[PDB]
Amino acid sequence: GTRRRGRQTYTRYQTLELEKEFHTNHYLTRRRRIEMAHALCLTERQIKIWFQNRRMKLKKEI
């Protein structure tokens, strides 16, 4: 039905579960990414995007 959805946003529930994750680990593995697809209930590539935009927005660690 709806496979080609056009949305470039994220919900608090996602931004949160994604924030804490990036805080604990810097790099996400293949299996680790899938583990998030369940809790977050999103595509496997969706997570990569949040990491590509986030990791790019920030730099180094204070």
From Swiss-Prot:
<comment type="function">
    <text>Sequence-specific transcription factor which is part of a developmental regulatory system that provides cells with specific positional identities on the anterior-posterior axis. Binds the consensus region 5'-TTAAT[GT][GA]-3'. This homeotic protein controls development of the cells in the posterior thoracic and first abdominal segments. It activates the synthesis of the decapentaplegic (DPP) growth factor.</text>
</comment>
<comment type="similarity">
    <text>Belongs to the Antp homeobox family.</text>
</comment>
<feature type="DNA-binding region" description="Homeobox">
    <location>
        <begin position="3"/>
        <end position="62"/>
    </location>
</feature>
<protein>
    <recommendedName>
        <fullName>Homeotic protein ultrabithorax</fullName>
    </recommendedName>
</protein>
